Design a binder for this molecule. Structure first.
Ligand SMILES: C[C@@H](c1cc[n+]([C@@H]2O[C@H](COP(=O)(O)OP(=O)(O)OC[C@H]3O[C@@H](n4cnc5c(=O)nc(N)[nH]c54)[C@H](O)[C@@H]3O)[C@@H](O)[C@H]2O)cc1)N(C)C(=O)NCC(F)(F)F
Ligand SMILES: C[C@@H](c1cc[n+]([C@@H]2O[C@H](COP(=O)(O)OP(=O)(O)OC[C@H]3O[C@@H](n4cnc5c(=O)nc(N)[nH]c54)[C@H](O)[C@@H]3O)[C@@H](O)[C@H]2O)cc1)N(C)C(=O)NCC(F)(F)F
Lengths: 140, 140
């Protein structure tokens, strides 16, 4: 079971999320990201089990990354599905802030509002190695 | 003196450029990117000199990356300046295509139109490892 699951938006967070996978793998962590570890079968099943098997949940807060979550009242958006699982299993959630504006809780679905209550890490283009060291201090 | 100079747009390519840095150093290339290796002094000469010392010139073509070069007569846009140096020095230009649309050459200033004649490498989120290896094979 991989120890770090990376959840992100294919849209605005694909590059950071891959740059995080590499960096954590360089420091020895076993990393799940979809385009490399999501393999055969029913992905709904397997993605949820990958969040369930990972002690660490790294969530890439790229600009507008929770917009598709807002008014996803039937829990059919995939960042929404991943966050709820992580909160449900008590995972060490670690958000990564990259030009992300914090929603008010009320605009998000109730089952994922708790994600705003975790200390996030601001991504610094100018000080990436320090940001990586900080992200790794946060990992368990 | 570094072997590889990375040219990029801070607002669209900052992540892929940093992703390219980490991977290339991993493979043992000495990589120049401004955030890590631009240092004291007048940047307008430190920058041009570093393009001149690197055999390889890697150009991150994120979306819109050459836009601010358009109509830049007096060569004051930095992507424009870095590109013209690579062309005038006969550098090993390896463009990286990240959702970039090829402009018609005549929208670009005359002194960088030739940059379009080089073989670009398409960045594949799904096949990042394959993409990195192809980049290495292009490098001298
Ligand atoms: C459903 C989709 C998916 C997987 C993981 N996630 C997690 O949820 C977050 C990202 O979600 P996003 O909201 O940012 O983007 P999306 O919702 O649009 O994703 C779906 C989009 O990909 C394309 N698309 C759709 N269907 C398939 C498919 O069968 N096969 C392939 N190759 N592409 C497919 C299409 O373009 C579509 O629109 C992340 O945290 C993921 O971990 C979300 C969605 N999926 C199965 C794959 O990708 N499989 C390839 C991979 F990942 F294994 F390499
Ligand atoms: C002029 C600027 C620069 C350097 C290299 N390049 C190459 O040219 C391409 C970039 O393309 P861009 O179109 O994005 O450039 P820009 O005009 O937008 O940059 C302006 C933005 O940078 C910030 N800004 C501006 N002025 C300073 C400054 O004195 N001091 C610090 N700390 N930040 C500064 C600010 O945020 C601003 O708004 C790349 O290929 C670079 O290699 C372009 C511009 N510069 C000196 C730095 O950055 N130095 C910090 C560094 F790079 F060492 F980390």
């Amino acid at each position: 079971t991989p120890d770090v699951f990376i959840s992100y938006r294919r849209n605005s967070g694909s590059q950071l999320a891959s740059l995080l996978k590499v960096h954590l793998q360089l420091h020895g962590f076993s990393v799940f990201i979809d385009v490399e570890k999501l393999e055969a079968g029913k992905f709904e099943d397997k993605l949820i089990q990958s969040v369930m098997g990972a002690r660490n949940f790294v969530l890439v807060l790229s600009p507008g990354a929770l917009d598709k979550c807002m008014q996803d009242h039937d829990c059919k958006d995939w960042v929404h599905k991943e966050i709820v699982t992580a909160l449900s299993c008590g995972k060490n959630i670690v958000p990564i802030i990259d030009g992300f504006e914090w929603p008010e809780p009320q605009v998000l679905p109730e089952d994922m509002q708790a994600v705003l209550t975790f200390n996030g890490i601001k991504w610094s283009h100018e000080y990436q190695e320090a940001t990586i060291e900080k992200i790794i201090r946060f990992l368990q």
